[PDB]
Design a binder for this molecule. Structure first.
Ligand SMILES: C[S@@+](CC[C@H](N)C(=O)[O-])C[C@H]1O[C@@H](n2cnc3c(N)ncnc32)[C@H](O)[C@@H]1O
Ligand SMILES: C[S@@+](CC[C@H](N)C(=O)[O-])C[C@H]1O[C@@H](n2cnc3c(N)ncnc32)[C@H](O)[C@@H]1O
Ligand SMILES: Cn1cc2c(n1)c(=O)n(-c1cccnc1C1CC1)c1cc(Cl)c(F)cc21
Ligand SMILES: Cn1cc2c(n1)c(=O)n(-c1cccnc1C1CC1)c1cc(Cl)c(F)cc21
Ligand SMILES: [Cl-]
Ligand SMILES: [Cl-]
Ligand SMILES: [Cl-]
Ligand SMILES: [Cl-]
Ligand SMILES: [Cl-]
Ligand SMILES: [Cl-]
Ligand SMILES: [Cl-]
Ligand SMILES: [Cl-]
Ligand SMILES: [Cl-]
Ligand SMILES: [Cl-]
Ligand code: NA
Ligand code: NA
Lengths: 380, 380
C-alpha cells in the first residue's frame, strides 16, 4: 500500500522565480495607483538583463527601472561577485497597451460582475488534509528548505550562500480510503549557489545540520534517507547567468508540487481578469472549503472558461473516495455556495489589492491566510 | 457516474507555440551538425521581435537569423497585414555557452550511459485506452481542431484565417472500473485570428460547418452541445502583437490536456540531457507500454532525478484501479524492463535525431509513431 511521491521547490533567486517576482512587482506597482489596471507582464532574465514584455493598460505612472531593480535588490543580487547586480544590470522594456480587440471582448462597457473571462482555459484547485494548511507534505517541505536557505543567507549564518537554490523532497506515503498519510522522507535534494571559497564538505555538512534538520521533523528522517546535497559538485555560477529565466516556468512549484492537476496557465504578472490566476485561486478556495468543512479529506476541482464569457463552461469535482457524498452532490454544494465569475471572484478574494509579489515565491497556496486560504462556511 | 472534463489546444501561430517551435528549430539546427550539442534555448516573442536567450555549447555553425525566420515563414506570418512578418521582424540573440559548472557536474568526462541528469526535477507519463493512440479524447479533439484551421488556411478554403488560434473541448464521460468512456461533447470553444473584412456570422458558420463537423464525429454532437465560436467578437490583432509569447508556457497542451499529472518542466529548446524532456518522453513510453501490453487500461508514472545523478531518485505507478496487478507489481515490471538513465533513454528513443520541431505543435504525444509512441514488449 505504500508509494513514493516527489515534489520540488526553488528559491527567490532561481532565475524563473526572479521573473515571477518582478512580474508581480510590476503588477503591484500598477494596482497601487490604478486598481483596474490591465496587466500581462512577462519577464525574461539572462546574464545582465531583465526584459519586460507584454501588455499593460493602466492609469498608473510606473518607474519600471526602479520597480525592477528594487525587486532584484530584495532577492539579494547586489554585486557582480554573485553573478547579478540590481545596480548595474540592463533593464529593457517592450510593453504595449492591451490589444483593443481583447479589451472590447472582455471588459469594455461591461458591468464588473459580468466581465468576461480574460481568456479561455482550464484551472484546477486541490486540497489535502495531510497537513493543517491542506497542502501536500512534499511541496511544503521543499518550500521550507528554500526559505531556510534564504533565512541563513540573510542572517549571515552561512555567508557563502547565494540566492539561487532548488530543493526536492520524496516522501513515502501510505493510503487510507483515498486519503494519503506521510510515513517518512525517502530522499532530499538541495542545490544552492555558493561562493568560490567554501568547500563541498563544509557545504554538505551545513545543509544537513543547519538546513534539513532545522526544517524536517526527525521522525521523518532515518538511516535509510538518501541525501543529494550539492550533487553537481560545484554551483558558483548561478542566477540568470547560469540559466535563463522566464515568467510562468515554475507553475507546478507555484501550486501543488505535482499533486492534484494543472491547467497550464501561469499566475505572475496578471490582473484578476486573467482567469489563469483568479479562477485557480478560487478553485483552491473551493477545494480548501470542502476539506475544512469536513465534506472531503482530499479533493480536486476543475473549472474552465471561454474568453468573453463570465460563467465557467464546466465545473468538475473528484474526491478520491474521501467523501460519503457523491461527486455530483459535492458539485451541487459548490454551485450553491460559490459564484466563479471573475467579476465576483475579484470581490470575494479582494484581487485588486497589491499583494501579488508576496505570492511569487514559496508557492501561492498554503500560507499567510490569503483570502483563498480562508475557508467559506458552506450551506447545504 | 458521469462527469465533465475540459482540455485546450493552440495553433502553430499562437505566440507561445511560435516560441516552442523556434526553440526546437534551433535545437534541430544544432543537432544536424553536432549530435552532442548542449542546448537550452528559450524564445520570447512580442510585436516585431523574436529574442533567443539561453545556453548552447555546440560545434555547429548555426545561422540564427535564417533558422528563426524560416520557422516563422512556415507558421505563416509573412506580411505586416497579419501582424508579423518573418522577412522584416527583429531577431535578437542573447545566447551564451552552457555554464561550465553545470557541464562538469552533468556530462564532462562521463561515460554516455552514466551521464548525470541535466537537472533535478519530476516528470510524469500517462496513457489511457479511451483512444487508439492512448490519449484523452478531449486533448486529441482540441489539437485536431487547430490542425484543421491550419489546413483550411493553407489550402485557401478559408483565406480570412490567420495562424493564431485556440480551441477547447469539454467532454462528458462515464467511468468503468477506473477507465473513462467518452459519451458526448458538451462544449466547444474556437478562437482564431482573422482578417479585417470577414464578418462574425460568416466565421461562426464556417467554424461549425467546415471545422467542427470535419473533425468531431457527429455521434458526439447533439442539440445540447454548446458552441462558443469567436466568443470575443473580434480577433484581428493576433500573434505576438496581441500577446507576448514565451517558450514552455503551453506545457499542458504539450502533454495530456490536464489529465494525468505534470512535473512542471518544458520540453522545447532542450537536448536529451535535460530530463524535463527525455524522462517525460520515457515516462510516456512506459505508460503506453503498460496499456498496450494489456496490464492497465489507464496509468500514471512518476519519475524524479537529481542533477548529476544518472538513475532516477524515485519511480511511482498509479493504475486507477484498472489492473489486476498491484501498483507494486507494475513497478517491478517497469524496473525489470526499462532503464531510465538519460544516457540510456537517448539510445532507446534516438534522442539525438533532429525531429524536435515536429513535436512542438499539436502535442508531443499520441501521434506520428515517434519512438516513445512505439510500445516496448514487456517481459514478466
Ligand atoms: C540546471 S539549470 C538548467 C539547465 C541549463 N539551462 C543548461 O544550460 O544546462 C536549472 C537550474 O538549476 C540550478 N543550477 C544552475 N547551475 C547549477 C549547478 N552548477 N549545479 C546545480 N544546480 C544548478 C539553477 O537553479 C538553474 O536555474
Ligand atoms: C487572450 S490573450 C492573453 C491575455 C492578454 N495577454 C491580455 O493582454 O489581456 C491569450 C491568447 O488568446 C488569443 N487571443 C488574442 N487576442 C484575442 C482576441 N481578440 N480574441 C480571442 N482570443 C484572442 C491568442 O491566442 C493569445 O495568445
Ligand atoms: C473516472 N475519473 C473521473 C476523473 C478522473 N477519472 C480523473 O482522472 N480526473 C483527474 C484528472 C487529472 C488529475 N487527477 C484526476 C483525478 C484523480 C483522478 C478527474 C479530475 C476531475 Cl477534476 C474530475 F472532476 C473527475 C476526474
Ligand atoms: C493514494 N494515492 C496514491 C497516489 C495518489 N493517491 C495520487 O493522488 N497520485 C496522483 C498525483 C497527481 C495526479 N494524479 C494522481 C493519481 C490519480 C490519483 C499518485 C500519483 C502517482 Cl504517479 C502514484 F504513483 C501514486 C499516486
Ligand atoms: Cl529550472
Ligand atoms: Cl496574459
Ligand atoms: Cl485603467
Ligand atoms: Cl500539519
Ligand atoms: Cl495548527
Ligand atoms: Cl495563452
Ligand atoms: Cl534548460
Ligand atoms: Cl559539442
Ligand atoms: Cl480511437
Ligand atoms: Cl486503429
Ligand atoms: Na496567457
Ligand atoms: Na530549466
Amino acid at each position: 500500500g505504500t508509494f513514493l511521491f516527489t515534489s520540488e521547490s526553488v528559491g527567490e533567486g532561481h532565475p524563473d522565480k526572479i521573473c515571477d517576482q518582478i512580474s508581480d512587482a510590476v503588477l503591484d506597482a500598477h494596482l497601487q495607483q490604478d486598481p483596474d489596471a490591465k496587466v500581462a507582464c512577462e519577464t525574461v532574465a539572462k546574464t545582465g538583463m531583465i526584459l519586460l514584455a507584454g501588455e499593460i493598460t493602466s492609469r498608473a505612472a510606473v518607474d519600471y527601472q526602479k520597480v525592477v531593480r528594487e525587486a532584484v535588490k530584495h532577492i539579494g543580487y547586489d554585486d557582480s561577485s554573485k553573478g547579478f547586480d540590481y545596480k548595474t544590470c540592463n533593464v529593457l522594456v517592450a510593453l504595449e497597451q492591451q490589444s483593443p480587440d481583447i479589451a472590447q471582448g472582455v471588459h469594455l462597457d461591461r458591468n464588473e460582475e459580468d466581465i468576461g473571462a480574460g481568456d479561455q482555459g482550464l484551472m484546477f484547485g486541490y486540497a489535502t488534509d495531510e497537513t493543517e494548511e491542506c497542502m501536500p507534505l512534499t511541496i511544503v517541505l521543499a518550500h521550507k528548505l528554500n526559505a531556510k536557505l534564504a533565512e541563513l543567507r540573510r542572517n549571515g549564518t552561512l555567508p557563502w550562500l547565494r540566492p539561487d537554490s532548488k530543493t526536492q523532497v520524496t516522501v513515502q506515503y501510505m493510503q487510507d480510503r483515498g486519503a494519503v498519510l506521510p510515513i517518512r522522507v525517502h530522499t532530499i535534494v538541495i542545490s544552492v549557489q555558493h561562493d568560490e571559497e567554501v568547500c563541498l564538505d563544509e557545504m554538505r555538512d551545513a545543509l544537513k545540520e543547519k538546513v534539513i534538520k532545522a526544517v524536517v521533523p526527525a521522525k521523518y528522517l532515518d538511516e535509510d534517507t538518501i541525501y543529494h546535497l550539492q550533487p553537481s559538485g560545484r554551483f558558483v555560477i548561478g542566477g540568470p547567468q547560469g540559466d535563463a529565466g522566464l515568467t510562468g516556468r515554475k507553475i507546478i512549484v507555484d501550486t501543488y508540487g505535482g499533486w492534484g492537476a494543472h491547467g497550464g496557465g501561469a499566475f505572475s504578472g496578471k490582473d484578476y481578469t486573467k482567469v489563469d490566476r483568479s479562477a485557480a485561486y478560487a478553485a483552491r478556495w473551493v477545494a480548501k472549503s470542502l476539506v475544512k468543512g469536513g465534506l472531503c479529506r482530499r479533493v480536486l476541482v476543475q473549472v474552465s472558461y471561454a474568453i468573453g464569457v463570465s460563467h465557467p463552461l464546466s465545473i468538475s469535482i473528484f474526491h478520491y473516495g474521501t467523501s460519503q457524498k457523491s461527486e455530483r452532490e459535492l458539485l451541487e454544494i459548490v454551485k450553491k455556495n460559490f459564484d466563479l465569475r471573475p467579476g465576483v471572484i475579484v470581490r470575494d478574494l479582494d484581487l485588486k489589492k497589491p499583494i501579488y509579489q508576496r505570492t511569487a515565491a514559496y508557492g501561492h497556496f498554503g500560507r499567510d491566510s490569503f483570502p483563498w486560504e480562508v475557508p467559506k462556511k458552506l450551506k447545504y
